[PDB]
Amino acid sequence: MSELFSVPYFIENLKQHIEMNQSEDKIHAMNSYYRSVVSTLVQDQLTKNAVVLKRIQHLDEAYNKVKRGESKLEHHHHHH
Amino acid sequence: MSELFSVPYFIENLKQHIEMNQSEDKIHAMNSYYRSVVSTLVQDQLTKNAVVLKRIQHLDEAYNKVKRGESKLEHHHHHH
């Protein structure tokens, strides 16, 4: 019932932001969420620049996923 | 040799973004110029995660300076 640890979990949270609108935005969702995590990582315990940096470098994968999916050009089949 | 050594120089660039329109925006000026610098500080040379971390943490002073210069300009939701 925890469902976490998995990186895809962090991104799956972004999908709801763009998909729905509980309390965020579209592309500007990552910026908010991304900044939210960054603060936690830095606030965590900055035990090692790597520990915090590693999470930052990896977290970039999420930010890119949103942009790469929110990019101007898109291709699929829509839904209605 | 002696050039761009001063950190305040980086901020002075932001003032132009908000003041003028060198192909940027207002507050979002820092975000764009922010992700640009940190991105370079990480690509320039990874001599040490800390060497870049300390520089990044310092840059925070710049971004904060831009906002700090504002006045919650973003549709006040009527809140103390």
- Is residue A18 within a helix (H) or strand (E), and if so which, with residue range? helix A7-19
Structure tokens that stand for A51 in this block: 């520990």
Using a CB-CB cut-off of 8 Å, the residues of chain B touching A31 are: 31
- Tally of CB atoms within 10 A around A35: 11
The whole-angstrom separation of Cα A10 and Cα B59 is 26
The answer to whether residues B62 and B11 touch, using CB atoms and an 8 Å cutoff, is yes
DSSP helix/strand/coil, A74: coil
* Centroid of chain to Cα A53: 16
The whole-angstrom separation of Cα B78 and Cα B49 is 42
DSSP B25-78: -STHHHHHHHHHHHHHHHHH--S-HHHHHHHHHHHHHHHHHHHHTS---S---S
The whole-angstrom separation of Cα A59 and Cα A34 is 8
The whole-angstrom separation of Cα A23 and Cα A33 is 11
Q: How far is CA A51 from CA A11, A58, B19, B29, B34, in A?
A: 20, 11, 38, 29, 21
The answer to whether residues B43 and B56 touch, using CB atoms and an 8 Å cutoff, is no
The whole-angstrom separation of Cα A64 and Cα A62 is 5
The answer to whether residues B42 and B52 touch, using CB atoms and an 8 Å cutoff, is yes
Using a CB-CB cut-off of 8 Å, the residues of chain B touching A50 are: 49
Most B CBs within 10 Å: which of A49, A63, A67, as the mutation test of the B interface? A49
Q: How far is CA A56 from CA A9, A18, A31, A77, B49, in A?
A: 16, 22, 13, 34, 11
Q: How far is CA B3 from CA B7, B33, B55, B63, in A?
A: 10, 19, 17, 21
CB pairs under 8 A between A and B: 14
The answer to whether residues B21 and B14 touch, using CB atoms and an 8 Å cutoff, is no
Domains assigned to chain B: 1-69 (6.10.140.40)
